[PDB]
Amino acid sequence: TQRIASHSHVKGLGLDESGLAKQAASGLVGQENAREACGVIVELIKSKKMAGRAVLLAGPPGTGKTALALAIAQELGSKVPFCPMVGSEVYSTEIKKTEVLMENFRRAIGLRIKETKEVYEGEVTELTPCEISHVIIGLKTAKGTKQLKLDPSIFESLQKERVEAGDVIYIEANSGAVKRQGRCDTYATEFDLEAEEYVPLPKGDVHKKKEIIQDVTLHDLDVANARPQGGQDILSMMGQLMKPKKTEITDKLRGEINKVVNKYIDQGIAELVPGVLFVDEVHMLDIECFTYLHRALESSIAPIVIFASNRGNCVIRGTEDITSPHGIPLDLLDRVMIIRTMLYTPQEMKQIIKIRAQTEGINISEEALNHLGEIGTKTTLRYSVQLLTPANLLAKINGKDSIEKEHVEEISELFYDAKSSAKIL
Amino acid sequence: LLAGPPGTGKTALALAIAQELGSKVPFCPMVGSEVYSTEIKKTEVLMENFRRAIGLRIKETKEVY
Amino acid sequence: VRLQRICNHPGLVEPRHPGSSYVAGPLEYPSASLILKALERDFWKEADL
Amino acid sequence: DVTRIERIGAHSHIRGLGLDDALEPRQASQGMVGQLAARRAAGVVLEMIREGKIAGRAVLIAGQPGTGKTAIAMGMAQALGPDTPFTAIAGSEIFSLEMSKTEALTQAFRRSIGVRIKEETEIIEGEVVEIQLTLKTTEMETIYDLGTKMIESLTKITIDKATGKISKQKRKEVVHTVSLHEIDVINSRTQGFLALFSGDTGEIKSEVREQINAKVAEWREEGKAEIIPGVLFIDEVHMLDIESFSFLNRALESDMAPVLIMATNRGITRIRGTSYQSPHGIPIDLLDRLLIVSTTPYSEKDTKQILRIRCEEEDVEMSEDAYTVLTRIGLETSLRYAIQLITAASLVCRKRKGTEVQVDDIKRVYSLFLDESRSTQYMKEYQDAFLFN
Amino acid sequence: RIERIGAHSHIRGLGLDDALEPRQASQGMVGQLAARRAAGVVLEMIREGKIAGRAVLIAGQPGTGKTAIAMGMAQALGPDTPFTAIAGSEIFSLEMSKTEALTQAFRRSIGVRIKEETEIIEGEVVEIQIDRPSKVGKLTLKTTEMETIYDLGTKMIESLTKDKVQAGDVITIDKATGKISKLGRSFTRARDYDAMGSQTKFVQCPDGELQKRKEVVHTVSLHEIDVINSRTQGFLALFSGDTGEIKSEVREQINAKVAEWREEGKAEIIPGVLFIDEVHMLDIESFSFLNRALESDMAPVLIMATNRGITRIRGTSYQSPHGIPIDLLDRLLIVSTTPYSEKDTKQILRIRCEEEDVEMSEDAYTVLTRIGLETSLRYAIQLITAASLVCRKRKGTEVQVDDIKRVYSLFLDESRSTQYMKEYQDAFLFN
């Protein structure tokens, strides 16, 4: 079955119709103010007309900032691009961190493009070339037989796939892609033992045109056009042998792709679904990255950006002495809306522990739940929810189907939290 | 070395020297920041700029049909 | 009838389709023909090096 | 409505500098309010750019954060139009693994100078379906000789009369403005024009740059090309190194140098790469070459007018009391914070099934979202819980 | 042979009973009762593979046995579950970023179990006739139970000709691809020709039907799928390590397709263990990435070992308990290893002696355990081999106290070397 992760319990922000946060709903308890603000931001993303708007989730560790970001993602649904990111990911060996930030900005903007797909599929009845401007290929389906004049590119892809006759092939005219999916079924009976696989002949038309919606991001278009993989000319073929490094895509390519996308939007063949970029541990970005974000958020194309930071007066990385509130420069803090996450009361921690127990399929007695809540008050919320699985394992070893207080005590003694460990250090 | 406060005509004097020599003599202008390259070492950049400050003039009687 | 079709095979009600890439037309970059004639240099000024 | 790639960004309301013909700035016009002195200076700088006679002039827009320096730059870009090159970068973008800071600045400089070339083509063709070639058109009928095989593809349109180029009714003329960077990237490799998109250009050599400068000067003399000098905008120029600034010093002294606009929002600070303190994070030798335009903090009525312009840009109607409350907030916290409160309060009113932003909506958004000062205070109150203080 | 007696060669497992209770000395594993019990609980959690992205830290003084606990966990886990062990210094590459290296380590620790239904024909070749001018041919194969004559198509004829099949070969043929794999030469035909040839070793004739279908399980790691799917001949980068910054979208596609395979009965996910030894060598950026790399459902169990206490976090001036930032420390459970008593030290020395196959007297054991308590356990463990060699040079069979003292005098520990250095401090450079 599905593996249980640290956020598997969050299914939404748990807000009612008016946007007010239910005390406990959709796997979230407490943080009602932050959840309501995140609902407002969800409405902002769904409104779809504002670009480059940034929010900052500020609060000590354990307060649920990443949980709230993933709750926003759940609220939006899989349709809207949610790009998760960590501040440590900008430091790439191939491209400048500004390029990484721009790429993440571009893949948080999604496109749904309706494309007409031209398909030729059938049994190859004949394959006659003409000097090499032509290939006359006959294709047979259940509906009938047709012979088609195809480009040298499609012929030479057919030679790549090694289709001779009686072979069932699938040609996509748009991409010039040929698939030899086997030999026809009528030739299975030829031999007792033959070294190929037989497929029934296609039952549709030889020439089929199909309208399909493709989900792509602006980054997909940028990368495809900066590392072209279509086209069969020798020059591009020999460039395909290069190590596929990430390149610092220029603003000109992005502007050209913007023009193309605008044309598609005008033609009605595409719809823009701008999403959200989630940069967790934004404090890891250095001063250069923040100062670039200054410009990247002014763009009319930018997505909604969510930052999360748990640092209190950290030095800005790269500055070596400049202390800013959240490890973030003040000039960037002037561009963001700060959502603050507060610490949890013992009761909220107990509710969260019960929710995590339910998600991990663990039965915990009331005594055990109270003891674990007491431990979490003493140690941390994260420590307590981690004890649940080992405690359940010990309970199964004892042959009981529930976590009693003794199992929690045993696991508490076996393992330590940061405070106990620091004490013994 | 042309040493003096900013704006005292050092670059102007170097360009005046270039003018007094004419385009016949190769004048390679450079900034000290240009030695820092991601492709070659600073020593190679300096050596190359030394290379291109020495000019060679080739005389050929070019016949064509 | 629909339920019987689903019971026989779900591919009767919704087929599994091939997964395809989006073919984007090549980007046309326009520029003047005089740009390519840069670096040409005049014949009768190029010696034999 | 259909969402286009271009949406409501920070500076979408700015359509240009709201300047009279005498360059005197209108109080509010073309989406810009206030900054009369700075707008006038930007207008005279823009006239300098349009004239395009003096090369390598540098202007610095200085002021407190949120005083509209980037807004003035975007207004200048909108006034300049799409035919003159306007290259916008951030000071951070020159720190590349592909190229040195010097090379990044050189490319940015050569992306701002454009060479305009107009060509006469030959196109007469039209309504023809027959095969050999004779052509017929509503007003024309012609015959053409041919002694090559290109017609096979042409069978299954219009042709060039000179070279016979084939492609799917008079000579017609085409204008192409190409930047110097485009010229030297196209001519750096066999297929170097691809690097204009992939960025895999990697330190174009000084030899080819010199040759291309010479050829462009030759074209200018011969009348085949004219130079369209542009403007390079470096936002957050304080991110540059001392090496980058020293390069900018002498990069601006070429006759092929664009007009340089720089923006910075810091006082006397450390120059990156050094321990020295300089007025703008910029060495004094570069400031020596700069004309500095200072932006004044906005007054109450200027702030309210900016909020009005931003509201009508975002298509949100607010009450007058909401406008006064939001202006007080902006004067108390920041202009950007109020600008964002506008959108958030429109959303809150929308959830309410309302049509006009009220004071209660602004209060609710003020509660939900914090400014830097309030968040910093709440942080000070929980100082121990946060990491690495 | 290529595996010699390593430092942890004696560690065959955690030495726990069915109650996860540690036996004093079991599976080459002495003492560390509480730490071993915790390791057993973590091992059970790994076996269940139900909860993703779990982090455990083994913390203790040097020489208390954190790496031994990790090796025992690896041995008890078995070859089937992925177990990637790295040092924190290994993520500092010139090929890729630290985050990329950590992602690759994470995806090496997840295993994908792909079961496919093949249809092979396996038999003994008793006849093969190939006619060549399209080629014609006939092939007769037999098991112990049946014999069948196959009329060969051109593709199958080509496959057989490439694989040079004769009578007496035991071969398996894949019905889909026609791949010929020959398992040897058979009992009946066996010997082959009366020509040059070579020696002979024979296999058995297969039993049952020629066509036997059968289901085979193929195991890969997520990293292998990423590398193969990234570079069109990126497979050779699985050996050269030449995969620079695999794209995030490629990995998302891999994850989605693996989940799809799991839903459709093709793939089974085997969550493994990533063991970062000397995790204090990671910098703050790496720890920040680790924080969020553990939130994914495709995240292994993470074991970390560190002997630091109240130390600077690399890349920062901050002091934290284990050289690990407190936010990552709140994400993990801490297993503390206690120092060793006299009898635990003696038992470990006996186990190492048995592993190295050295007999030594009980007086030697007393002296060496005293030395280990005074100097360190590792130094005594090395004195084991040194003294065995000295005894063999002496032509003895049992290592006596005199050999132990001889090797104590020959080889120094840190304390005595540091003292002798302190005496001649001026002679050493850059003091």
Ligand SMILES: Nc1ncnc2c1ncn2[C@@H]1O[C@H](COP(=O)(O)OP(=O)(O)OP(O)(O)=S)[C@@H](O)[C@H]1O
């Ligand atoms: N209000 C909440 N309701 C339910 N689960 C929560 C809540 N807040 C936090 N959690 C969860 O408790 C665990 C710890 O919270 P995380 O969000 O993973 O860490 P974090 O503290 O948000 O990270 P930061 O950036 O340091 S605040 C995760 O399993 C979260 O899903």
Ligand SMILES: Nc1ncnc2c1ncn2[C@@H]1O[C@H](COP(=O)(O)OP(=O)(O)OP(O)(O)=S)[C@@H](O)[C@H]1O
């Ligand atoms: N003696 C001079 N006569 C005429 N023009 C001059 C003279 N000295 C400088 N200039 C000009 O005044 C301006 C400033 O002088 P520059 O030559 O640019 O500075 P520099 O002294 O050459 O180099 P710096 O600033 O000392 S690092 C330039 O436009 C020069 O051409």
Ligand SMILES: Nc1ncnc2c1ncn2[C@@H]1O[C@H](COP(=O)(O)OP(=O)(O)OP(O)(O)=S)[C@@H](O)[C@H]1O
């Ligand atoms: N052009 C300017 N005119 C007037 N005041 C300015 C100007 N630029 C900066 N300041 C002042 O400098 C303050 C801080 O500027 P920032 O750019 O945010 O950081 P900073 O100026 O570099 O200061 P630090 O602490 O040395 S990094 C502003 O709040 C202003 O008061």
Ligand SMILES: Nc1ncnc2c1ncn2[C@@H]1O[C@H](COP(=O)(O)OP(=O)(O)OP(O)(O)=S)[C@@H](O)[C@H]1O
């Ligand atoms: N049950 C055990 N637990 C721990 N160590 C043991 C155990 N049995 C034997 N050892 C010793 O552990 C040694 C491994 O090196 P040690 O440094 O002493 O411990 P370690 O496993 O490497 O952990 P660290 O990181 O060094 S504290 C072996 O040479 C054994 O002598």
